[PDB]
């Protein structure tokens, strides 16, 4: 009885994973409740009309090796009154707010966070600055570099604040074990972007919290990476902290819909926010974290759809 | 020789001004250099294919009273290889990164700042936090409220940090408050709009604006003053430099590209506060005039914007 538009693929490096999530989303959905229209976005950004399903498939989604050129559409022709888009797109141009902006301009409800909270959440420098300003959530140690800042003292700031190895990424990846590697990593990263992140390399436990909702934020029990332990075996104090931090991070950025909060837990029991992930994999932890809480994958989906409509009504009213 | 797609109108409250800026841009442009294709976005969000100019117009653009239904297009049909979009859209859906995202998805070069620096610049809470963390640019005194924070200590925090009157707005319902009761009433409606609410100090100070232009080579204008426009503003060299440095730093920190206008307050004892960074300023109005005083004519200003647009597009697509 509802039309879901399931966009998958994309232009980012994470685009092959996107096809996998979209395939898992399309087999997990309850068709009692949805007609599903799928559209592949190719690596060059083209929109391809591919299979509609009125009933459960069992049936491959399109890939960049299998484009059918006659099935190409005008991108705005995804549009249908009252359809809700589920953008199963990861990394840049799936999580950086460009797809969200496109769908806002097309006037369609869509699953997941809005434009501000997507771009901010994707930009670790901005995320860290917002969170250190507005919250007490600890961020993985980092240094921000804006082209123009004197290099020699940036280098010294990196060595004061961080311990080698560090990782250098343009804002929108090279490892450094010493100051020479660092200089060489920064020089290429400035060719990419005028804003550069240098981040502490961390070897610690990787523990993840699912987040769901719009105004009423729910979190899962944490689950651990390394194989998955769901739930993670951790002290109650750490469970509470991680879930509070996740919810606080989501509320502060004005996220809505879903996210997954990726934490590090050190041998001394210190918790650091590593990353807020606004469109997490569905291939993978996010669905399974909610499954452990008693929320099934098909019902998880319907909830995402109802939150999408609620944000749309709210943003259109 | 170049195709400029000029998008005007929009769904924001500033959409009537948008039409005037676009009329001013279509008249100031050098048609030696451009074929101009105009598209009106209606208040409801539809795209209307309206005039294409190959030479200077005399010649009015569409309005929400004058829509021609048959001239409606599919929004992606604005697309044309190698055409550069100038989105003359102000406020929400015009400066909030939604338009930029839509054009990025359509794969078109566009004038102005990218998705992140638009949405951040539009959100005063995030801008202020970013700038106070990464810079020494003073921000107009403010308090941020996230729905969930206990109300009483927010009220007291407003009264500790700020002096009445204050203005309350949802971050996504603007009310003035002169007292704690006005404040509570204003916050309560603002929260029906958005979970994030800004409370900002009312400031009665001199208003002085700085044009910014460029991508990696950031250029700024001499400051210009609002009340009539004094361009350049008559201010001490120390304030001029400070303003222009704060403007360029704000632009660089946010990752802006293309253009912005920075609006400052200047108080009676010579203190400077950043009020706003405006990423698509009016072209009706200070921005072109600020550059005109620097010797940069409006027509060549536009050519520079276009060339900056093609340049960011190349960096993005690579």
- Per residue, what are the HEC states of chain B? CEEEEEEEECCCCCHHHHHHHHHHHHHHCCCCCEEEEEEEECCCCCEEEEEEECCCCCCCCCCCCCCCHHHEECHHHHCCCCCEEEEECCCCCCCCCHHHHHHHHCCCCECCCCHHHHHHHHCHHHHHHHHHHHCCCCECCEEEEECCCCHHHHHHHHHHHCCCCEEEEECCCCEEECCHHHHHHHHHHHHHHCCEEEEEECCCCEEEEEEEEECCCCEECCCEEECCEECCCCCCHHHHHHHHHHHHHHHHHHCCCEEEEEEEEECCCCCEEEEEEECCCCCCCHHHHHHHHCCCCHHHHHHHHHHHHHHHHHHHHC
Distance from CA of B55 to the nearest CA of A (A): 30
Tell me the C-alpha distance between B249 and B253, whole Å: 6
The SS3 of residue A69 is: helix
Candidate from A146, A172, A193 with C-beta closest to B253: A146
Strand order in the sheet with B196-201: B142-146, B196-201, B166-170, B175-177
Location of each CATH 3.30.1490.20 domain in chain B: 139-203
Q: Is A100 close to B98, i.e. CB distance below 8 A?
A: yes
Q: Contact, B21 vs B284, CB < 8 A?
A: yes
* CA dist., res. A97 & res. A116, Å (int): 7
Kindly state whether A134 is in contact with chain B, defined as any CB-CB distance less than 8 angstroms: yes
Determine contact: B101 vs chain A, CB below 8 A. yes
Identify the DSSP state of A77: G
Resolution in angstroms comes to 2.2
Q: Do B126 and A130 count as a contact with CB atoms less than 8 A apart?
A: yes
| CB-based contact B134 A147, cutoff 8 Å | no
CATH, domain range B112-138+204-318: 3.30.470.20
Closest-approach residue (CA) in chain A for B10: A105
Number of other CB atoms surrounding residue B179 within 10 Å: 11
Domain ranges in chain A with CATH number 3.40.50.20: 1-111
Q: Burial letters for A122-135: b for 16+ Cβ neighbours within 10 Å, e otherwise?
A: bbbbbbbbbbebbb
* C-alpha distances out from residue A115 to A105, B32, B302, Å: 12, 38, 28
DSSP assigned state of A279:
S
Sheet arrangement for strand A72-73: A72-73, A47-53, A34-41, A2-9, A84-88
| Helix (H/G/I), strand (E/B), else coil: A100 | helix
Long-range contact pairs involving B61-69 (C-beta distance under 8 Å, separation at least 24): B61/B8, B61/B19, B61/B22, B61/B23, B61/B26, B62/B9, B62/B19, B63/B16, B63/B19, B64/B9, B64/B15, B67/B40, B67/B42
CB pair distance less than 8 Å for B255 and A194: yes
Q: Residue B12 and residue B22: Cα distance in Å, rounded?
A: 15
Taking alpha carbons only, the member of B196, B204, B242, B216 closest to residue B307 is B216
Q: How far apart are CA B118 and CA B260, in angstroms?
A: 10
Q: Please answer whether residues B61 and B22 qualify as being in contact, where contact means their C-beta atoms are separated by less than 8 angstroms.
A: yes
Residue of chain B whose alpha carbon sits nearest to that of A191: B315
Which residue intervals of chain A bear CATH 3.30.470.20? 112-138+203-317
CATH number of A139-202: 3.30.1490.20
Compute the count of residue pairs across chains A and B with CB atoms less than 8 Å apart.
131
Query: Nearest CA of chain A to the CA of B229: how many Å?
Result: 33
Long-range CB contacts (within 8 A, 24+) of A237-244: A238/A265, A238/A269, A238/A271, A241/A271, A242/A207, A242/A209, A242/A271, A243/A209, A243/A219
Structure tokens at A125: 């420098």
Residues 6+ apart with CB under 8 A from A229: A223
Q: For residue A305, which of A9, A91, A28 has the smallest C-alpha distance? A: A28
Q: Does domain B1-111 have CATH number 3.40.50.20?
A: yes
CATH code given to domain A112-138+203-317: 3.30.470.20
B165: cis peptide before it, omega within 30°? yes
Q: Are A272 and A213 in contact (CB under 8 A)?
A: no
The verdict on whether residue B49 carries a ligand-binding annotation is no
A:38-57 residues touching chain B, CB 8 A cutoff: 45
Distance CA A142, CA A125 (A): 8
CATH topology of domain B139-203: Dna Ligase; domain 1 (3.30.1490)
Check if the beta carbon of residue B25 is closer than 8 Å to that of residue B112. no
What are A153's two structure tokens? Answer: 């003292």
CA distances from A120 to B36, B40, B117, B313 (A): 34, 30, 9, 21
Q: How far apart are CA B128 and CA B226, in angstroms?
A: 23
């Amino acid at each position: 009885k509802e039309t879901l538009v399931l966009l998958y693929g994309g232009r980012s490096a994470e685009r092959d994973v996107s096809v996998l999530s979209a395939e898992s989303v399309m087999r997990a959905i309850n068709y009692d409740n949805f007609l599903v229209k799928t559209y592949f976005i190719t690596q060059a950004g083209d929109f391809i009309k591919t299979q509609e399903f009125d009933s459960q498939p069992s049936d491959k989604l399109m890939t960049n090796d299998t484009i059918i050129a006659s099935q190409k559409i005008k991108p705005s022709d995804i549009y249908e009154e009252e359809a809700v888009v589920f953008p199963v797109l990861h990394g840049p141009m799936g999580e950086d707010g460009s797809i969200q902006g496109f769908l806002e301009v097309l006037k369609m409800p869509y699953v997941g966070t809005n434009i501000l909270s997507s771009s901010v959440a994707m930009d670790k420098i901005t995320t860290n600055q917002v969170l250190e300003s507005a919250t007490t959530i600890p961020q993985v140690a980092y240094v921000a570099l804006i082209e123009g800042e004197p290099l020699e003292s940036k280098l010294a700031e990196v060595e004061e604040k961080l311990i080698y190895p560090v990782f250098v990424k343009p804002a929108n990846i090279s490892k450094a074990e010493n100051r020479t590697d660092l200089k060489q990593a920064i020089a290429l990263a400035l060719k990419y972007d005028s804003r550069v992140l240098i981040e502490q390399g961390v070897d610690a436990r990787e523990i993840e919290v699912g987040i769901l909702g719009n105004t009423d934020v729910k979190t899962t029990l944490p689950g651990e990476i390394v194989t998955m332990a769901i739930p993670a075996e951790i002290d109650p104090v750490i469970v509470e902290k991680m879930r509070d931090y996740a919810a606080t991070a989501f509320r502060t950025l004005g996220c809505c819909g879903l996210s997954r909060c990726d934490f590090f837990l050190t041998e001394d029991g210190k918790v650091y926010l590593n990353e807020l992930n606004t469109m997490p994999g569905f291939t993978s932890m996010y669905p399974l974290l909610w499954e452990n809480m008693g929320l099934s994958y098909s019902v998880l989906i319907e909830e995402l759809v109802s939150l999408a409509k609620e944000m749309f009504d709210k943003r259109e009213s």
